[PDB]
Amino acid sequence: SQFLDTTRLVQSCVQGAVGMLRDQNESCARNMRRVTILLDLLNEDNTRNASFLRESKMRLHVLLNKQEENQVRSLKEWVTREAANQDALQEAGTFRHTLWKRVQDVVTPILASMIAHIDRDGNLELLAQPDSPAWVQDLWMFIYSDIKFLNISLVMSFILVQSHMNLLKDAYNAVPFSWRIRDYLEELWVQAQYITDTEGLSKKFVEIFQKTPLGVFLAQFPVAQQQKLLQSYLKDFLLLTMKVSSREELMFLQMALWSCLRELQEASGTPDETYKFPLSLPWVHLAFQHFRTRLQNFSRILTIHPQVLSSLSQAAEKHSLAGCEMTLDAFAAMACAEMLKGDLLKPSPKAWLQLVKNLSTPLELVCSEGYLCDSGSMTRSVIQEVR
Amino acid sequence: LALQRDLVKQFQNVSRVEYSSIKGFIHSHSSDGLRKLLHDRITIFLSTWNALRRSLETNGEIKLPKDYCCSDLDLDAEFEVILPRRQGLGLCGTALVSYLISLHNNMVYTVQKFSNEDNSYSVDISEVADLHVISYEVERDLNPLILSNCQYQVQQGGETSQEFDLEKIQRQISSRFLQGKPRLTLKGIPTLVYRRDWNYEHLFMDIKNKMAQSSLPNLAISTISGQLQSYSDACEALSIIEITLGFLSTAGGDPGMDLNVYIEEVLRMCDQTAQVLKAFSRCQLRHIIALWQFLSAHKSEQRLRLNKELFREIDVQYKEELSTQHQRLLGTFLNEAGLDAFLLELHEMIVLKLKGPRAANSFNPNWSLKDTLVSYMETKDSDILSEVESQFPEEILMSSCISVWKIAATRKWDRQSRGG
Amino acid sequence: XXXXXXXXXXXXXXXXXXXXXXXXXXXXXXXXXXXXXXXXXXXXXXXXXXXXXXXXXXXXXXXXXXXKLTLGLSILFMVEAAEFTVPKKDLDSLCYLLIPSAGSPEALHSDLSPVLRIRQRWRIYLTNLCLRCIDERCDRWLGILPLLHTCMQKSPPKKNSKSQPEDTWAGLEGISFSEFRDKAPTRSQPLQFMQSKMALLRVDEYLFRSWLSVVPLESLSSYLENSIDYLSDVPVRVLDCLQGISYRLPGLRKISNQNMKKDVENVFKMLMHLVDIYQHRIFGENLLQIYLTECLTLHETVCNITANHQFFEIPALSAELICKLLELSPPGEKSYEDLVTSTLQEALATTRNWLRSLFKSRMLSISSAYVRLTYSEEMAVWRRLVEIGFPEKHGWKGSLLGDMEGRLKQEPPRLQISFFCSSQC
């Protein structure tokens, strides 16, 4: 409607809405970057910024309608309520500016309340980085245009924009809404686990995801986008689940979880109905649920004794590692034991024993009985060397 | 912790939770599997509470009132006891998690103090799992471990002695269950912030930390007070400065060269008027806290000299008139006085520390105005305290703070109006 | 063919879990009946037909001699392949197997739960049954409506359109009843079912709402007078009457015929009747604010669907209803004072806006030396809307009369007097 310039209204409310936002106190606070991004993409220079306008105005429309249902009818006539507010007339000057500042004051915390929902873990940079691929912005504007998938609720105040990934220095996510897809797939996991017994749980979880609207959006991609999406969701899944105090620790956990995925995609003999969807986001959750203890053991090894990382950087070049079988816990085990082999008593006779006692429980867990569920011959051969 | 992370993820609100009991919350879920998982986690929570709800009253560091730790919590209890807040009735979950972390950490500390002598292995509480916590059982873990170490011995003369080797039991417990565990930092404790707007004192502390902040020049005061003699301009200027101090809380900048040219017209501000910016022209970014308090005191004294009610949010607890000899001592203070700093700082103390109801829990209207004023100025150790505030009448109460500011501001306006 | 027999026996044996010697022997007898019908068989239109004939003989013995929930659930799982195309008449029977007869408590359906344990598959079976038999019989599917309201969540206490539409309130959510209840008036027959099966209202908390959502508007006040016996037991279901009327009105257009005016008039008089029968026990456990917000919403709605300026009876009744709820309310406190003040304010705001909406462009026009009102029933509108009794300390007397005086003083004094002695004032 041409009763009010709504795009200029939103552009005016940007700074006051971002100034209400607080991160979790050490997250390299992003308010200037949110302002720069949102003022660069609340224009209509493109058809991309025009899409962000249409859906940002639609989210404002639905949140203002949900606010106005609980509003009484006297406060719902905003102009008549504003002509009787003598102090607002008197602080704004004329009457137009009073009405306009009233719409500013209504729209600003609603706009802050949606920036706090579509910015966290650095989601707005994927919308604003140059030459980010088309599947990224298509998935961004799909999840953002969907009301019941991404539920925004309502709250001169402070809105906490809560970070889930707790990422590295400007290590913002790579899938558009990683936390929402992770929570969505855990909801489908608990539902499919309640429904189906633990024999067709993988089939049921993959097919439940393929029948859902985000799954049928992601199935419309071609394959080269689906592989990039699966790799980025492995990275964002590990940042949402575990904490990497390195970027090489992240790449080894990403190699590990990718080989776990490829091991579970080869556990069944020849189904050929569910391996029609092998590049699907439930396989990351399946791989982590089936190899959780080994992945957490491997990250504990990389945490206690970090100098194994460089040794793994040799062993990957020795192996072309992370194929179709999870072995990085075993090779981290073998490399730690070979370092304790070569270092006989060298920092001291006491600090060597301290390193042995620190690596006792992960190495004793690796070469134990209830650790390796079912692997190939070469993983067990590396476990024999570790024994 | 999975329970509390799910609840913080779901209920990051204030005063909104429409649930009477825990059964009112479990049964309000459409999907059945999520309801079962929620019921299992709440059952674990309540059993662990009912186990520890007396060691928390004594040994826990979160001192919580005795109404909480006296009854046995079941599913008919209040919904608030499963939410992790830090004020009331939701201190139960926080105190439980803190006590379990303390148990785990004191055990790990005793193990390291004994033999390991140092260990930097320390994971955060936002990512604990089953292998980071001290986890054993008593039937299948401790009782065979003890029975394998009760050694029997028969002498030639004839008897049968039992004996524990306590060092072997210490070694096997400390080897199976206690070694290789991290030290759980309290970093990502799941919590609800329970609060809308925390006041400007911590925000001004944040700006004073990230940036250098000096007072305004005496030329800049004249420039600002000249450009926005209108009331609407002073209101607009105060609005802009409040938005910018919200941004400079979470960031900083060069204290020189105010963010007009390089941000406030190229980063699409695009809206503000001319004489407000002409007031802000002779300012830099080390002049933001001083500019805020100048514009706030300026807006209030323009409310004064145009005969409007001028505090209106401070309660009547601090708004009563001076009597005669009180205001004679006030007048002989105001004869030799730096009014332009005194009423500026006094208006700062009024609008920050006095905000209507429930302010007399910390700002008793029976103290002396001198002592609470110099305390408020020595919290941030101002050079403004160095002036005539030591010559203030020590017998003026805080029940008449507003009228002291009105008398000082009316004297300032009568001087600068009757003089020029 | 006989390839679905293995899957049917496997899932019926799954249904033998969480039952007691009912569905497994039914699977055995179905296998025996199929083996009996295996003599000189035919194509796939014969196997399903003979199995449906055996199931219909079992249902005939089930509704003839012994007159049964598990048998109807099993026949739902059998006829998921839609075997009753020409046996469409069996829709009269299967629904009878699924009306929970002698199933009066809600704890009884808590007891007959686990045969239909998982709450999503039989929900869509029962819903496809309700959508299927909604053809030119459609009288018995309401008896299903207990069952699939035990296959879903609890009842929404929030008011009209602030959180829920028709479907979430009534609890149907798959059935397009909004087109079905607006029809040529040949569908009083559902209420005839509701006349007999009324004892089912102790089963649900939704069946009263859903039944309000199925009845046509010309038959709803009868539904309001048959429900006095049930609302005597539970007197908080007057709020459900108000929500079920403030749901039907804004989906209805402008009131244009005398029949619709008489229908909504009967509905408002029966709401007043149900209010002044009981007590402020209607307002039990502090439910007043939802009643006042609901009747303000009902007032705003029903002022927006009358514009013929002679249908002032309908906003007149919807303001006498808010009058009745304000005079029958319990005073405690200051919050009650603020609630009655605010409620009367927005009621007069809606009334004045409706009056200024349909009184337009002058009051009394002459054009023939015969001065008269251009709105032929205008003074009746003002008499009716002023002479209803709100309390004196509030408005409604100065404001509406001031509006009328301002409308009259827009006339010249030669014509303001000439109407006053023209045998119409």
Residue numbers in the entry:
A (entry chain A): 3472 to 3626, 3636 to 3867
B (entry chain A): 4731 to 5150
C (entry chain A): 475 to 541, 591 to 855, 863 to 955
Quote what the paper states about this structure.
RNF213, also known as ‘mysterin’, is the major susceptibility gene for Moyamoya disease (MMD), a cerebrovascular disorder characterized by arterial occlusions and abnormal blood vessel generation. Notably, with a mass of 591 kDa, RNF213 is the largest E3 ubiquitin ligase in the human proteome. It combines RING and AAA (ATPase associated with a variety of cellular activities) domains in a single polypeptide, making it a unique E3 machine in the ubiquitination system. As seen in the high-resolution cryo-EM structure, the 584 kDa RNF213 protein adopts an intricately intertwined fold that is organized into three major modules, namely an N-terminal stalk, a dynein-like core with six AAA units, and a multidomain E3 module.
